[PDB]
Amino acid sequence: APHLVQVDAARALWPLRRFWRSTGFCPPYVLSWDQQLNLAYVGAVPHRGIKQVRTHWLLELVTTLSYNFTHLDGYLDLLRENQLLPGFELMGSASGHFTDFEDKQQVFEWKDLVSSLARRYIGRYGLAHVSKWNFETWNEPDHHDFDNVSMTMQGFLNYYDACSEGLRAASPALRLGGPGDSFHTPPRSPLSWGLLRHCHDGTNFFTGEAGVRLDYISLHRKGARSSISILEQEKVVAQQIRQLFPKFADTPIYNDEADPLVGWSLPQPWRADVTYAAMVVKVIAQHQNLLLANTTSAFPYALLSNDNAFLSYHPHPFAQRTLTARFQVNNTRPPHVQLLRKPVLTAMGLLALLDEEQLWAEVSQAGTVLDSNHTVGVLASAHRPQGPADAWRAAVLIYASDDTRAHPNRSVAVTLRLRGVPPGPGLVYVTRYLDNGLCSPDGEWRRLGRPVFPTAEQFRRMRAAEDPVAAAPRPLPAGGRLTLRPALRLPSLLLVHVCARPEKPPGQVTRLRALPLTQGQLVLVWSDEHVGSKCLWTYEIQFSQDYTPVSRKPSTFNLFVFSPDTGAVSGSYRVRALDYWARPGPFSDPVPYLE
Numbered sequence: 001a002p003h004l005v006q007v008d009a010a011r012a013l014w015p016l017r018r019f020w021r022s023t024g025f026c027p028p029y030v031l032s033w034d035q036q037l038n039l040a041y042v043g044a045v046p047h048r049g050i051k052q053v054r055t056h057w058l059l060e061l062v063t064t065l066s067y068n069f070t071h072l073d074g075y076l077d078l079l080r081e082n083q084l085l086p087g088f089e090l091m092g093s094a095s096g097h098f099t100d101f102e103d104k105q106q107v108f109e110w111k112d113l114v115s116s117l118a119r120r121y122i123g124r125y126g127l128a129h130v131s132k133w134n135f136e137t138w139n140e141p142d143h144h145d146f147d148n149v150s151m152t153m154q155g156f157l158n159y160y161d162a163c164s165e166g167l168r169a170a171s172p173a174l175r176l177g178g179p180g181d182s183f184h185t186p187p188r189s190p191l192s193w194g195l196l197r198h199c200h201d202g203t204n205f206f207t208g209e210a211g212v213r214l215d216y217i218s219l220h221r222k223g224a225r226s227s228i229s230i231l232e233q234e235k236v237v238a239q240q241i242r243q244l245f246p247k248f249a250d251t252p253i254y255n256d257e258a259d260p261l262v263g264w265s266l267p268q269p270w271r272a273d274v275t276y277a278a279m280v281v282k283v284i285a286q287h288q289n290l291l292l293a294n295t296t297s298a299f300p301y302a303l304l305s306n307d308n309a310f311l312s313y314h315p316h317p318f319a320q321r322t323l324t325a326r327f328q329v330n331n332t333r334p335p336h337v338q339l340l341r342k343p344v345l346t347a348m349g350l351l352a353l354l355d356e357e358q359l360w361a362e363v364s365q366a367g368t369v370l371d372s373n374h375t376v377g378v379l380a381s382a383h384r385p386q387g388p389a390d391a392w393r394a395a396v397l398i399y400a401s402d403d404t405r406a407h408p409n410r411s412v413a414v415t416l417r418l419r420g421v422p423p424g425p426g427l428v429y430v431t432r433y434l435d436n437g438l439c440s441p442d443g444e445w446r447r448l449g450r451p452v453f454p455t456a457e458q459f460r461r462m463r464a465a466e467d468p469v470a471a472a473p474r475p476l477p478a479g480g481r482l483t484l485r486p487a488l489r490l491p492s493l494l495l496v497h498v499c500a501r502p503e504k505p506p507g508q509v510t511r512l513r514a515l516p517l518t519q520g521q522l523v524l525v526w527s528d529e530h531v532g533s534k535c536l537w538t539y540e541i542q543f544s545q546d547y548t549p550v551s552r553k554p555s556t557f558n559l560f561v562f563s564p565d566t567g568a569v570s571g572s573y574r575v576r577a578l579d580y581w582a583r584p585g586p587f588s589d590p591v592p593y594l595e
C-alpha cells in the first residue's frame, strides 16, 4: 500500500530555521590548492546552504611575546572569500609555546592571544561579521587530544576563562560556547560536566565573579548507523542539563558532529552516494519534526553539523565521510587535483531551498500516520514575500531512506497531495529528483571501470551525474492544488518547488571567479547573494574570446567546471541567473582568463 504525503500550504505553523548549515574537518594542508577547491565547492552550495566550517587546530596556524598570524590570515581569507564563517575552535599551542594551563603566566598569555586574534580579525573583517562566529573551546576535551599541552580539570577551567575574558576584551558582542564533547554518564566526561558547573557556579579566573558566560552548549553525538539514535541521545543529554543546571534551560544546544557513524576515514559504500545524502536529510527532518515542531518539552536545539568537509584519499575517493570526491591525477604534466560533487553536497543545496516557515504535513500508509522516525518522510516550507524581487514559495522535500542500508530492487510508491496554495500570478512548479541510478557520480565512476587517474572525458561523464533530475516548469492546477504519484527509489530525495511570479526579474550574479585545474580545464564559481530569489532554473554562462552561451544541462549549484573539447579556455566569462519564467537577470562583471 502506497505512502500518502499530505501538505497544507495554507497552514504556516511555526518558523522554520535552517539549523543544519554547518560542516567541519581536521588537518592531518589548509592552504593547498586542494583545500582551496574544497571550500569553493562548500561555498557554492546555493542560498548560503553551508555557512560555517568547524576547523580543528586553528591555533597551530600561529607561531611565536608576539605572534605571526600569516597562515591563520590565509585560511580565514579563504573562508571569507567563499562566503563562509569559521567554527572557531580555540585549539592549538601557538606552535609549541603553550604547555600548561595550571601555570598562571600562561593563562594570562592565552587571554592576550585570544584578544589579539579577535581584535585583529574584527579589524580585518568588521565586528558585524566576527560577532557571527561560533568561537568554541578545544575539541573533545575529554578525549585526551591535547598533544604536548597539559590540560587538567582545573587547567581546562582556567583555559575557558582566558578564552571568555579574552574574547570579551576584544568585544562583548562575541559568542563563545563549548565543551564540544559527548557528555557520557558521570564519572565519565568530567571536563564536559566540570565546565558547566564552573560556568554555572564557579568563580572566574580573572574577575573572581561567580558564574562565567556560556553562550551555547555543544555536544558530540553520533548514531552508529541509526538516524533516530542521534536525536534520542541528544534528548537524554539536553534533559539532564535542564535539571542539573537551571540557568542553562534556555542555553542553545549544538550538536556539531551529528554524523551517522564515527570515524570519517573508514570507507563505507553508503557514504559514496544518495544513501548518505538521504540519511542526512532524514536526520534533519527528524530534528525539525520530533524536536522543534512546537513539542511540549521544546529543548533549545539550535545547530546541527555534519562533520564532512574532509578531503578523501586513495584508494577511497568516494567511500569516506566527505562532501567532495578527490582525484589526485598524478600522470599529467604537472600533477593536478580534481574534485567531484558528491550527492550529499547536492543534498545540502536542496535543503537550502527550504524557507522561513514550516507548513503542516502528514505522512501515512493505509491510514496509519507515520512520523519522521520511518523510511519515508517530508519537510515542507513557505516563504513570505519581501520585495519586488521575490514572491511566495513552497518547498516540499521528501526522503526515502533506510539509514545506511540501500534497497536497489524496491520501488516506494508515494502519492503527494498538495492543497491550500495561496492564489497568485504565474503559479508554476518544478521537481528535482536524486537517486543512485540517475545521480551518482560514484556509480558512473564504476561504469567507467574505476579509473584511478580519470581522463578529461571520464570527468565530464562523472560530473553529468552530479545535478538532480529536473523537470521543466509546469503551471499549477486550479484551486491551488497539486497531486503527483511518483515512484521513489530507496534511497531517494524529491523536492517539489512551487513558485509565484515576482514583479522584477532576478538580480545580478556577483563575486565571479576563475580557478585553474589543468590544461583546457577550469572552475567557474560565483555568489547568489544579490539574486534575491530562490525560484531559479539555471545559471547562464557566456564565453568571449575577442560572448557566446556555453551550452549545458540546467543546474543551480553555484559552481561549474568548464572543460570543452577544443581546450580553448582563454578569454572572458560572464554569468547571469534564469528564473522559472525564463526572465534573465543582469550579467555578472566579466572575469578575464589566460593560460
Ligand SMILES: *[C@@H]1O[C@H](CO)[C@@H](O[C@@H]2O[C@H](CO)[C@@H](O[C@@H]3O[C@H](CO[C@H]4O[C@H](CO)[C@@H](O)[C@H](O)[C@@H]4O)[C@@H](O)[C@H](O[C@H]4O[C@H](CO)[C@@H](O)[C@H](O)[C@@H]4O)[C@@H]3O)[C@H](O)[C@H]2NC(C)=O)[C@H](O)[C@H]1NC(C)=O
Pocket (backbone or CB within 6 Å): 028, 265, 313, 314, 315, 328, 330, 452
Ligand atoms: C598520487 O600522489 C599523491 C601525492 O601527491 C598520493 O597521495 C597520498 O596518498 C596516500 C593514500 O594512498 C596518503 O597516505 C595515507 O594517508 C592517510 C592519512 O594520513 C594522515 O593521518 C594519519 C592518521 O591521522 C597519520 O598517520 C599520517 O601521518 C597523516 O597525517 C593514512 O590514514 C593512510 O594510512 C593507511 O593506509 C596505508 C596504505 O597506504 C597503510 O599502509 C596504513 O597502515 C594505514 O592503514 C595513508 O598513509 C598520503 O597522505 C597521500 N599524500 C598526499 C600528499 O596527498 C597518491 O597516493 C598518489 N596516487 C596514487 C594512485 O598512487
Ligand SMILES: *[C@@H]1O[C@H](CO)[C@@H](O[C@@H]2O[C@H](CO)[C@@H](O)[C@H](O)[C@H]2NC(C)=O)[C@H](O)[C@H]1NC(C)=O
Pocket (backbone or CB within 6 Å): 228, 232, 290, 373
Ligand atoms: C523510533 O522507532 C523505533 C522503531 O520503529 C523505536 O524503537 C522501538 O521502541 C520500543 C519502545 O521503546 C522498543 O520496545 C523496541 O524494541 C524498539 N524497536 C526497534 C525495532 O528497535 C524508537 O523508540 C522510536 N523513537 C522515537 C524517538 O520515536
Ligand SMILES: *[C@@H]1O[C@H](CO)[C@@H](O)[C@H](O)[C@H]1NC(C)=O
Pocket (backbone or CB within 6 Å): 068, 069, 070
Ligand atoms: C611569518 O611566517 C611566514 C610563513 O612562515 C613568513 O613568510 C613571514 O616572513 C613571517 N612574517 C612575519 C611578519 O614575520
Ligand SMILES: *[C@H]1O[C@@H](C(=O)O)[C@@H](O)[C@H](O)[C@H]1F
Pocket (backbone or CB within 6 Å): 025, 026, 056, 139, 140, 220, 257, 259, 261, 262, 263, 264, 265, 307
Ligand atoms: C569528531 O569525530 C571525528 C571522526 O568521526 O573521525 C571527526 O569527525 C572530528 O575530527 C572529531 F571532532
Ligand SMILES: [Cl-]
Pocket (backbone or CB within 6 Å): 259, 260, 261, 262, 321
Ligand atoms: Cl558518517
